[PDB]
């Protein structure tokens, strides 16, 4: 759906890449957590590194991602997700505002 | 406090000034709404216009604001608020990430 209901949201944002990724933590009634974030248009790919596995869900926009040790970019648009293994990484680019939810897995 | 509890958060962000202001809508159990937002470092002041009155609460950072038809900037830091009348405007600058809550009044 278009919203999270019955959640806690931490007010202080997390900002990286000199302001190209801006997110907040969202905590659910069952004690699980997600990140609600925005990636702004990039010139070069942005690298994120995972400890626990993650699912990245695109809420709005279009991105190209190289996951783990893949060598070609994969395209994702709103409504699609990608999985990132634990202890790995992904490199993401976008030409427009990209809204996402990061699901801890 | 450092968080909102028992809220609805709309997933799609609102982004302005070519990515210098990024926010989400937060809706409370009583039907009231607030904006949770970030302003990134600015080179020139950013103008916002109000219909209903607003209180801007600084959560993190430091900004300078000219409110309504004031002619000198006023300084606000984390923990401080400013009031903007309805049918008016404010012009805001910051040199660092600025987290804020906009309260509808």
From Swiss-Prot, chains A, B:
Belongs to the nucleoside phosphorylase PpnP family. This is Pyrimidine/purine nucleoside phosphorylase. GO terms for cellular component: cytosol. Catalyzes the phosphorolysis of diverse nucleosides, yielding D-ribose 1-phosphate and the respective free bases. Can use uridine, adenosine, guanosine, cytidine, thymidine, inosine and xanthosine as substrates. Also catalyzes the reverse reactions. Keywords: Glycosyltransferase, Transferase. One of its GO terms (molecular function) is thymidine phosphorylase activity. Its EC number is 2.4.2.1, 2.4.2.2. It comes from the Bacteria. Disulfide bonds: none annotated. The gene is ppnP. It holds the Pfam family Ppnp. SUPFAM superfamilies: RmlC-like cupins. It comes from Acinetobacter baylyi (strain ATCC 33305 / BD413 / ADP1). It catalyses: a purine D-ribonucleoside + phosphate = a purine nucleobase + alpha-D-ribose 1-phosphate; adenosine + phosphate = alpha-D-ribose 1-phosphate + adenine; cytidine + phosphate = cytosine + alpha-D-ribose 1-phosphate; guanosine + phosphate = alpha-D-ribose 1-phosphate + guanine.
């Amino acid at each position: 759906s278009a919203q999270f209901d019955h959640v806690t949201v931490i007010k202080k944002s997390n900002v990286y890449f000199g302001g190209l990724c801006i997110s907040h933590t969202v905590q659910f009634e069952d004690g699980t957590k997600k990140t609600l974030g925005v990636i702004l248009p990039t010139e070069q790919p942005l690298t994120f590194e995972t400890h626990v596995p993650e699912r990245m869900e695109i809420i709005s926009g279009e991105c190209r991602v190289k996951i783990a040790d893949s060598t070609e970019s994969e395209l994702f648009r709103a409504g699609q997700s990608f999985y990132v293994p634990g202890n790995s990484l992904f490199k993401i680019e976008t030409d427009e505002v990209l809204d996402y939810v990061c699901h801890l897995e």
